[PDB]
Design a protein around this ligand. Structure first.
Ligand code: NA
Length: 121
């Protein structure tokens, strides 16, 4: 039906917006600490600590399949990247501190992204 096509066009345009958001958020991680999933070869106990791992490459895979139906779902995955890092790694590490900075700089991007999603519908 035409109503289904219109819903699919809205999802397509959301996906385009979230791709711009994701690129901007990943620019705030120039070290590429959060670019890939935590390797279970290199960190064998990781799943004992973190139950829902997340990273930018995993988010990009879901995004290109139009897997994010709204901004909240996208935000939940971005928050996992930060929140998992700040639990596993201690306060005095480069990893924890990179997550703090990504959160702080990322909040600026997500604030305006919310306004664009609401405005454009
Ligand atoms: Na901790």
């Amino acid at each position: 039906s035409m109503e289904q096509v219109a819903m699919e066009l809205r999802l397509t345009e959301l996906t385009r917006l979230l791709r711009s958001v994701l690129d901007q958020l990943q620019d705030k991680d120039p070290a590429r600490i959060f670019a890939q999933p935590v390797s279970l070869k290199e960190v064998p106990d990781y799943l004992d600590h973190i139950k829902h791992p997340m990273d930018f490459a995993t988010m990009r895979k879901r995004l290109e399949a139009q897997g994010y139906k709204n901004l909240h779902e996208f935000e939940e995955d971005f928050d996992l990247i930060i929140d998992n890092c700040m639990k596993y790694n201690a306060r005095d590490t480069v990893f924890y501190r990179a997550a703090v900075r990504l959160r702080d700089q990322g909040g600026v991007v997500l604030r305006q992204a919310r306004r664009e999603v609401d405005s454009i519908g």
